[PDB]
C-alpha cells in the first residue's frame, strides 16, 4: 500500500515528465502586487489572477542572467520537475510561460512565510515542533527519491508554512532526475554532504545528510557546522565532529549521528531498509505517518493570517519593474520551457 501509492504516483509523474505542460498562461492575466523573495536571476512575487481573483506566487527569471551564470539546464530542470510532481508538501505549480525577456512559474501562494523567519525569531523549535516538520520532509524525500529526483537544497529558507501549519517545499533550482550518480558542486554550504564537498560523485543520500542538518538547526536554533566563510564551514563538515546542545534528547542525538554520518554504508536513508530506518527510529515513535500525509495532525504553530493578499509573514524587498524587450532573448536555449 505504501508500495501501491508510489507505483501510481510514478505513472502520473512520468506522463508529465515526458510531456511537460507549456505556455498555459500569460503575464497580463496577473497583477503583480509585492515581492516575496529573490534569487540570482529575479524574484518570487505575490500576484493576483484577474479572471478568478485568486492569489498566486509567481517566479520571474531573467533569461539573459540565467545564461551569463551558465544555469540554463538547472532552470529547465526546475520547471520540468515542478510541473510534474504532486504531493501534499510540494508547492503546486498552476501555470508557466515565457516571453521575450523572462521565464515565469505561477505557484500556489503560501502565506505563512518561510520557516527560516519563524526559526530565527523564536530562536529554536522544541523537539515535537521540529519532529512535526521533519516527518513531512521524510515523506517528501521518500516520494521524490522514488521518482529518481534529488532535491539538493533543503533549508528553512525553502520550506514555506501554509494556512494549516504544514510545509510546502519551494525552489527546485538544484533538483535533478538522476539514476546513478551526479557531480555538480551545488547546494547551501551549511547543508552540503561531505561527499559533495570532496568531489566524489554522489546520489540521493546527500538529501538525507541535509535532513540531519535541518533537524539539528530546527532544534538548536543554529546549524551543526558554521563559521564566517564557506571554506571554514567545509573544513568542519569534513572533520565531522558534531557537538550537540545538552538539551537535545538522547533519541535526537542518536538520529543525528546516523543522518550526519560520513560513511555511506552507515548513513540512514541510504541502507538496505532505506527510509524505514528513519521512520522506525525512536525519535519518531510518537509519529503517525499516515496522519501526517493526510494533514490530520494538529500543527504546533498556525501562522497569523489577516486575509488574502496580506504579506506580513514575509520580509520586505526592493521592487523592480519588469521590462519585456521587443526582441526574443535566448529562444533556442529555453525552447522546451
Amino acid at each position: 500500500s505504501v508500495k501501491e501509492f508510489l507505483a501510481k504516483a510514478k505513472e502520473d509523474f512520468l506522463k508529465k515528465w515526458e510531456n511537460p505542460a507549456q505556455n498555459t498562461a500569460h503575464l497580463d492575466q496577473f497583477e503583480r502586487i509585492k515581492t516575496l523573495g529573490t534569487g540570482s536571476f529575479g524574484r518570487v512575487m505575490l500576484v493576483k489572477h484577474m479572471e478568478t481573483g485568486n492569489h498566486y506566487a509567481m517566479k520571474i527569471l531573467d533569461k539573459q542572467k540565467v545564461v551569463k551564470l551558465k544555469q540554463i539546464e538547472h532552470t529547465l530542470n526546475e520547471k520540468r520537475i515542478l510541473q510534474a510532481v504532486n504531493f501534499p508538501f510540494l508547492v503546486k505549480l498552476e501555470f508557466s510561460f515565457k516571453d521575450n525577456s523572462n521565464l515565469y512559474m505561477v505557484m500556489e501562494y503560501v502565506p505563512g512565510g518561510e520557516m527560516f523567519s519563524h526559526l530565527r525569531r523564536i530562536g529554536r523549535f522544541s523537539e515535537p515542533h521540529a519532529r512535526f516538520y521533519a516527518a513531512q520532509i521524510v515523506l517528501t524525500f521518500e516520494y521524490l527519491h522514488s521518482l529518481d529526483l534529488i532535491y539538493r537544497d533543503l533549508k528553512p529558507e525553502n520550506l514555506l508554512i501554509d494556512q494549516q501549519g504544514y510545509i510546502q517545499v519551494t525552489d527546485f533550482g538544484f533538483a535533478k532526475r538522476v539514476k546513478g550518480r551526479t557531480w555538480t558542486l551545488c547546494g547551501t554550504p551549511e547543508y552540503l554532504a561531505p561527499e559533495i564537498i570532496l568531489s566524489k560523485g554522489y546520489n540521493k543520500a546527500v538529501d538525507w545528510w541535509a535532513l540531519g542538518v535541518l533537524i539539528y538547526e530546527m532544534a538548536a536554533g543554529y546549524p551543526p557546522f558554521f563559521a564566517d566563510q564557506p571554506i571554514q564551514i567545509y573544513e568542519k563538515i569534513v572533520s565531522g565532529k558534531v557537538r550537540f546542545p545538552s538539551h537535545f534528547s538522547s533519541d535526537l542525538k542518536d538520529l543525528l549521528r546516523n543522518l550526519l554520518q560520513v560513511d555511506l554504508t552507515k548513513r540512514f536513508g541510504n541502507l538496505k531498509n532505506g527510509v524505514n530506518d528513519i521512520k522506525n527510529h525512536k525519535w519518531f515513535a510518537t509519529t503517525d505517518w499516515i496522519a501526517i500525509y493526510q494533514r490530520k495532525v494538529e500543527a504546533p504553530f498556525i501562522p497569523k493570517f489577516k486575509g488574502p493578499g496580506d504579506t506580513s509573514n514575509f520580509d520586505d524587498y526592493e521592487e523592480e519593474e519588469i521590462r519585456v524587450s521587443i526582441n526574443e532573448k535566448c529562444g533556442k536555449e529555453f525552447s522546451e520551457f
Binding site: 533550482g173 547551501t188 543554529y222 558554521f226 564566517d228 557537538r243
Partner: peptide, 20 residues
C-alpha cells in the same frame, strides 16, 4: 556560548546556494 557565536556570525541571514 555556541548560540552567541552563531548570532555574532555573518551567517544568520538567508543563505544563498553555491553552484557550477
Amino acid at each position: 556560548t555556541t548560540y552567541a557565536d552563531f548570532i555574532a556570525s555573518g551567517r544568520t541571514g538567508r543563505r544563498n546556494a553555491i553552484h557550477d
